[PDB]
Write a protein that binds this ligand. Sequence first.
Ligand SMILES: *[C@@H]1O[C@H](CO)[C@@H](O)[C@H](O)[C@H]1NC(C)=O
Lengths: 48, 48
Amino acid sequence: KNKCVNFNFNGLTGTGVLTESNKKFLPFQQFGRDIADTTDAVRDPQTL
Amino acid sequence: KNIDGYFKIYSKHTPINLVRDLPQGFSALEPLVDLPIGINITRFQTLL
Ligand SMILES: *[C@@H]1O[C@H](CO)[C@@H](O)[C@H](O)[C@H]1NC(C)=O
């Protein structure tokens, strides 16, 4: 975390810095989006 | 709703105090289930 990485979560690919979130995903949710239709936050498949 | 053979089931439980009909207002239903039955559905029934 806290570093520039090329991340791939279940095929959801991107590049960025991964930080601990304060978001409230619902039980069914996997990943967030931004107004730009870009992934803004994700859920780790191995850790909830 | 069964789309592309996908049986998607959303639900919501809420307390009420009314004996007439559906209370007027607004509340959203969260997904619970997605069954890949691949089965066409044309009719249904309820069981009490
Ligand atoms: C609809 O029925 C056909 C029968 O050929 C089947 O191939 C298809 O998968 C079914 N689709 C749904 C909506 O379950």
